[PDB]
């Protein structure tokens, strides 16, 4: 009985693969050969921020292009003024096992999550003069892996139980749930339009959701290993994924297929973060080789190297205006590059 | 030349001082990871130690040391992903139920041989030793381990299963403190304390430059 619909699904995959292959009239790798490369790129650590004392995990740039958020195994969620190294807040967490963080676009909220399965939202503009827990969202059955703000009232999250959800903060309930992954989802990233987002899971599949209908609208399967980080191309038409196979891959949302792959023969370690620059010409990624490497997104050449950490990097992010890029490692330091 | 943000600068310095003073106080505790199969004596050992849908952090103090005793078994997801978070724990409080083995052994092999835990020692509490006597009297262990030979006796059975656990270690650089649970307490705490003292001495003597 089930075998009939199983064969129907198999035929569906065969025909969708045929259609996907039919769209490959050319490739970006051969079209791009007409344009010149960006040349060799180098950068220096303009600041070394060393407030933390144990194993920074995740970070996020504020909208003001000035304020940083970072979280560590030490249990201190502290936010930094990048221009002048000053601390401005130290938020003591109820549990030290953090794995992700997010800074709201308006700057009024910072969100934290970890193995405790609960997402806690901290308010910054309280009249009392100190931060306080606005809400503690609950309902998941697996470790949180990424949090992002659509606005001050709606937060989206990705968890270790193979589901993603969108929360109405003012009511503390999962207003819409996204499902269909086989493995658990490791990271999440939402488009500038805020209408649609992607997430990657340990089953090597990365797929596109929309935040209003809740349907899974596209699925990509290029990798061979667990997905570990995703970030959109700045114009919202494409995104790149990092995987634990030393190769970063770029997918196009309208072609619905892989366009190019970034790899080099001497690297075998796993990816930990991915993020484009403001123009989209440059793709920055983190590695377990204790360093950071930057690729020309349209040439797939290792145009530069950003080494300088004593331990593997675990987070990365460029500013919303492209002025600088920040990265953090288990050595408990954040570097600022230009 | 600084503006009147000197107050912000001094506030940042105060935050740094407070963070350092909190970290130095927090560093005094010893961190343990408690692990095992479901029902495999975790509840028994924590209860006899006489002292939220995911991780749970038991906490108790003994001999001027505060033991943070984390139980990660509550979570149900890909172990290979979240396991790296518990790096730098001083020891693993592993425990198995003797009355129940062929998958607990695989889990122990995975944990002891993991990339991250290459250097950390392991305490291995054999549990349910009391009713294991009834188990061995009522049924032979050969149905569990066909390769076994020799007498069906309590002490040799315990020694053989302990050797089976011990043999799966790949590197001689780590110790494995096996001990019986005896469901009576007031002694296993001394065992874990001795293991922690050995680990502290080893770490201090390695860092100070004798290794």
């Amino acid at each position: 009985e089930l075998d009939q619909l199983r064969q129907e699904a198999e035929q569906l995959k065969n025909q969708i693969r045929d259609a996907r292959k039919a769209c490959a009239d050319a490739t970006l790798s051969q079209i791009t050969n007409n344009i010149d490369p960006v040349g060799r790129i180098q950068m220096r650590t303009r600041r070394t921020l060393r407030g933390h004392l144990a194993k920074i995990y995740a970070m996020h740039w504020g909208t003001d292009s000035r304020l940083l958020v970072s979280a560590s195994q030490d249990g201190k969620l502290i936010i930094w003024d990048s221009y002048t190294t000053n601390k401005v807040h130290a938020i003591p967490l109820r549990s030290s096992w953090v794995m992700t963080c997010a800074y709201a676009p308006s700057g009024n909220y910072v969100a934290c999550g970890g193995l405790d399965n609960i997402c806690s939202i901290y308010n910054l503009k309280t009249r009392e003069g100190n931060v306080r827990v606005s809400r503690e969202l609950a309902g998941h059955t697996g470790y949180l892996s990424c949090c992002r703000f659509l606005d001050d009232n709606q937060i989206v999250t990705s968890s270790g139980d193979t589901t993603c959800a969108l929360w109405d903060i003012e009511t503390g309930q999962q207003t819409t749930t996204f499902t269909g992954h086989t493995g658990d989802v490791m990271s999440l990233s939402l488009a500038p339009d805020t209408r649609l987002f992607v997430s990657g899971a340990c089953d090597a599949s990365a797929k596109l959701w929309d935040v209003r209908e809740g349907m899974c609208r596209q699925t990509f399967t290029g990798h061979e290993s667990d997905i570990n980080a995703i970030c959109f191309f700045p114009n919202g038409n494409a995104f790149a994924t990092g995987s634990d196979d030393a190769t970063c891959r770029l997918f196009d949302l309208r072609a619905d297929q892989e366009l190019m792959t970034y790899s080099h023969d001497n690297i075998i370690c796993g990816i930990t973060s991915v993020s484009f620059s403001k123009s989209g010409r440059l793709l920055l990624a983190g590695y377990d080789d204790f360093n950071c490497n930057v690729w020309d997104a349209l040439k797939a050449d290792r145009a530069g190297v950003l080494a300088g950490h004593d331990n593997r990097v675990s987070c990365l992010g460029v500013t919303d205006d492209g002025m600088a890029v920040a990265t953090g490692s288990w050595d408990s330091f954040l570097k600022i590059w230009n | 030349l600084s503006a009147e943000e000197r107050a912000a600068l001094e506030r940042s310095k105060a935050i740094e001082k407070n963070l350092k003073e909190d970290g130095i106080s927090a560093a005094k505790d010893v961190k343990l990871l408690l692990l095992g199969a479901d029902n495999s004596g975790k509840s028994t050992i924590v209860k006899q130690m006489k002292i939220t849908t995911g991780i749970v952090e038991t906490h108790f103090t003994f001999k001027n040391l505060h033991f943070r005793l984390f139980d990660v078994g509550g979570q149900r997801s890909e172990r290979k992903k979240w396991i790296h978070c518990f790096e730098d724990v001083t020891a693993i409080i592993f425990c198995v139920d003797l009355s129940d083995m062929h998958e607990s052994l695989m889990l122990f092999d995975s944990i002891c041989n993991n990339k991250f835990f290459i250097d950390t020692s392991i305490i291995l509490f054999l549990n349910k030793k009391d009713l294991f006597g009834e188990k061995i009297k009522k049924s032979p262990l050969t149905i569990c381990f066909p390769e076994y030979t020799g007498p069906n006796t309590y002490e040799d059975a315990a020694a053989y299963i302990q050797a089976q656990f011990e043999s799966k270690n790949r590197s001689p650089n780590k110790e494995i403190y096996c001990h019986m649970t005896c469901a009576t307490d007031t002694n296993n705490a001394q065992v874990i304390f001795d293991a922690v003292t050995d680990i502290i001495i080893a770490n201090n003597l390695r860092g100070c430059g004798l290794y």
């Epitope: 000035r66 304020l67 003024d81 000053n86 401005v88 807040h89 700057g107 009249r127 009392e128 003069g129 100190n130 | 030349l1 503006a3 009147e4 943000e5 107050a7 912000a8 001094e10 506030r11 105060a14």
Partner: single-chain antibody, 232 residues
Framework: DVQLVESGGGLVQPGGSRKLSCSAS????????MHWVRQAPEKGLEWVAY????????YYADTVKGRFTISRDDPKNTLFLQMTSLRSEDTAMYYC??????????????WGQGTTLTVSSGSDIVMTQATSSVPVTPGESVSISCRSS???????????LYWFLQRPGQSPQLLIY???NLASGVPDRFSGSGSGTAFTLTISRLEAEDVGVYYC???????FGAGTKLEL
């Protein structure tokens, strides 16, 4: 809610001494700095003393230094000012005011009720204001201006102007800080503007709730304008 209250007023013999204290509740006092400012019955505001969080720093006005001293007791959430050698110039109400300093924060956001004190007979950048008062009617728009002897703009890109409102029979309230940002809870119809040494506060769709006196303030370095009145 947040409450700042003070006590110790009344009358003083000339040349005597009096302890004045401030009481705070509803907020983490230890994380905030505190200023003490005073208002003569026939003059504008004048600054007196300041201490940062944790009592790490302290400042006094040159005309009040030595005669007065201030300190705070964080566990009791109380602030103390000790007065000695009181003279006729010292008669005024004294306001206990809140402050906090970090990027994006707004100082001087809340003011206490104040205590009256009277006595019987026995680098200083100056701010200027164009007029003592102007007439206005509800529904119209009017502009207020103040000027500084030195440029209040700083090399970091900010300018440290502040505008305060004091309604009759009430304590002051913060309207505009950093010369362009509106304080929390202030109606959106207030707005400041200016550059260099010439600064202007503007109001449109004026309402009877805006009738009062406006005090121009600077905060660049270690003063208040004479104040201007709005009459319906």
């Amino acid at each position: 809610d947040v409450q700042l209250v003070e006590s110790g007023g009344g009358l003083v013999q000339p040349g005597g001494s009096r302890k004045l204290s401030c009481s705070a509740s509803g907020f983490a006092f230890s994380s905030f700095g505190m200023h003490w400012v005073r208002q003569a019955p026939e003059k504008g505001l004048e600054w007196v003393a300041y201490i940062s969080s944790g009592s790490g720093t302290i400042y006094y006005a040159d005309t009040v230094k030595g005669r007065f001293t201030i300190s705070r007791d964080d566990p009791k959430n109380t602030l103390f000012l000790q007065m000695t050698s009181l003279r006729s110039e010292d008669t005024a109400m004294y306001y206990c005011v809140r402050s906090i300093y970090y990027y994006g924060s707004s100082p001087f956001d809340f003011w206490g009720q104040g205590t009256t004190l009277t006595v019987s007979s026995g680098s200083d950048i100056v701010m200027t204001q164009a007029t003592s008062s102007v007439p206005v009617t509800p529904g119209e728009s009017v502009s207020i201006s103040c000027r500084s002897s030195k440029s209040l703009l700083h090399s970091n890109g900010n300018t440290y102007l502040y505008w305060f409102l004091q309604r009759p029979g009430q304590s002051p309230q913060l309207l505009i800080y950093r010369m362009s940002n509106l304080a929390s809870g202030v109606p959106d119809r207030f707005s400041g503007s200016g550059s260099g040494t010439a600064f202007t506060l503007t109001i449109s769709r004026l309402e009877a709730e805006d009738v009062g006196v406006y005090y121009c303030m600077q905060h660049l370095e270690y003063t208040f304008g004479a104040g201007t009145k709005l009459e319906l």
